[PDB]
Amino acid sequence: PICCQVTLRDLFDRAVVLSHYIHNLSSEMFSEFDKRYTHGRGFITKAINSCHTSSLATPEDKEQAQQMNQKDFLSLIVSILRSWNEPLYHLVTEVRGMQEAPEAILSKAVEIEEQTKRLLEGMELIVSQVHPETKYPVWSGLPSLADEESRLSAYYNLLHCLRRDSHKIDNYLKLLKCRIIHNNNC
């Protein structure tokens, strides 16, 4: 490799690949859970405002993104990410060692659990590379044991909000990679 030097361009190029992958995986996993346990019933009634990262000053449309500072933006992405470490962990844990004969939902939970850490590792490098002169909301509460609507409503919301945030993260990283590297011309 000619360069030593880990290029910011190559840092985005890698991040955006994991953040894209991570999202497909969490959207498929939410679908495997809906299909096999929800598929209607009457959820997302108790899923609005259920996301724990909701409190954060997250850009809502394309104009608000466009208004935001790049280094504050990155700090926002990392916060989101750390935020999801503990819930992923519990997901994998609670599906493996508590679930009675679990499905192939576990295999694509583990994948995400792992690829998230890897992408956070990469996201800390890039926050590091562009210095922030500045300096994250926590919850992952998740019940064991599937029957009982009250137990798999929480599972539903973790899945639902993993789908949502993984998307943001991926959409912000691609927004950013075009702004600073491709000067909005990609």
Partner: protein
């Protein structure tokens, strides 16, 4: 003569990922003329608003401009039917713009026969004018399909994020038909693009 049957809101779509539109199916009008309205409640706010634009997408529709459209929010849409007898409200629809993205077909499809040394045809197209792939806000993926003038089987080539693709397995002689379609990184496929056609040298 009776109040309007219950209206049914079925399809919402977002062509560009900055605005979106909703369409409703009127209920039994109970014999009289019926006025419709749409009302909605965003996720977070406990305030109900009325649709901002009943005119932009035409009859029985509601269009949400950039100003009113926010992604990663769940909208709780309900439609209302009032006639002289009474009035009825539809079942609420929970709509999340993030996952209702369905883009228009690709334009400016062009076809060239080129050679590097062998010979290949390469397809070159452009996205919809409304999506913003330049700023990275809207990332897009394409597909292309090809088949000889008289065939019943298209061959599919996923082109990634490239608005071009070189094709190599084409047979010299017969003319081929080509069409592209697009998709958001995460979203739905569009209606295929106006077909182009070119004959291939010997």
């Amino acid at each position: 003569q009776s109040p309007p049957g219950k209206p049914e809101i079925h399809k919402c779509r977002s062509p560009d990922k900055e605005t979106f539109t909703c369409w409703w199916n009127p209920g039994t009008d109970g014999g009289l003329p019926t006025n419709y309205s749409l009302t909605y409640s965003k996720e977070g706010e406990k305030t109900t608003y009325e649709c901002p634009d009943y005119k932009t997408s035409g009859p029985n529709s509601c269009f949400f401009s950039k100003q009113y459209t926010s992604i990663w929010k769940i909208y709780i849409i309900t439609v209302n039917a009032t006639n002289q007898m009474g009035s009825s409200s539809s079942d609420p629809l929970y709509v999340d713009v993030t996952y209702i993205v369905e883009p228009e077909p690709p334009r400016n499809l062009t076809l060239e026969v080129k050679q590097l040394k062998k010979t290949y045809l390469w397809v070159k197209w452009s996205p919809p004018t409304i999506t913003d792939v330049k700023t990275g806000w809207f990332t897009m993926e394409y597909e292309i399909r090809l088949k000889p003038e008289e065939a019943e089987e298209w061959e599919i080539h996923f082109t990634g994020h490239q608005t071009q693709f070189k094709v190599f397995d084409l047979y010299p002689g017969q003319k081929y038909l080509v069409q592209t379609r697009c998709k958001p990184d995460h979203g739905y496929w569009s209606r295929w693009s106006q077909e182009s056609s070119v004959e291939m040298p010997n």
